[PDB]
């Protein structure tokens, strides 16, 4: 059988895919998430913070 990828496949998106939210996704908290702090977070003070009392 042909082992090469097929360029003649459909490159367009599929609207027939299910638009409804999937309830079978895992609801448990992921322990494999990165526990280290993120250095790439913005170090600059946010001007959009609420300036009122």
């Amino acid at each position: 059988a042909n082992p090469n990828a097929n360029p003649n496949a459909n490159p367009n998106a599929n609207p027939n895919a299910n638009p409804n939210a999937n309830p079978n996704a895992n609801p448990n908290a992921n322990p494999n998430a990165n526990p280290n702090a993120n250095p790439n977070a913005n170090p600059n003070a946010n001007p959009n913070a609420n300036p009122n009392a």
Partner: antibody
Amino acid sequence: QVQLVESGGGVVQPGRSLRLSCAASGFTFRNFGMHWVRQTPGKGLEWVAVIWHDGSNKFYADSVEGRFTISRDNSKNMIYLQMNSLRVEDTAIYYCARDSLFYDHDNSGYYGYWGQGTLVTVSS
Amino acid sequence: QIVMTQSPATVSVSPGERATLSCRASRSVTSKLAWYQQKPGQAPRLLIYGASTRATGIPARFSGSGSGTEFTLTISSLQSEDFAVYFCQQYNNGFTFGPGTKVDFK
């Protein structure tokens, strides 16, 4: 009757310092943060600076970074805009703008109430 | 930051009709966008804030809508006083204004 009356306008040659004053009445001054908004014909409204309710934090636009200084005292209900190193790009009307119509946590940063503003022109 | 554009720049409208003003941002703004009305010689006035909420004293004539990168302002039945310039502002990331659109007599 939230009224914002501005002053300090005039003509200043480039490279000199001008100071604007904004007197506010009709609301609790110390409970809100005030803004300065710049209106240039051919460029529209451009944001300049914002100060906190107690004056703890100050934020400026990129074009005015390091040259403009905003100050506020709560005993006289007035904010100021100390503008050093004026350049000919800065000729415009400067508006005194109040942040928010009322105190909401997730909605702040819109200029609910505006003053008439003053004309500041710089030339030779 | 976020660059705003408005289209069309000017629209010709006869009184009693319905006028539509469009505002588009380069990046997502979620639901933090305001519309201002400025008359010649007058300071801009806040019409709509957040995405659709109307400022106090603003008639139900003015209807705002939109989310994300596409926002729209419509006026149900413009009288003479609804002829002015309108600005689009976002306060989600920085503070940037649109070029401003004008409604003119047709």
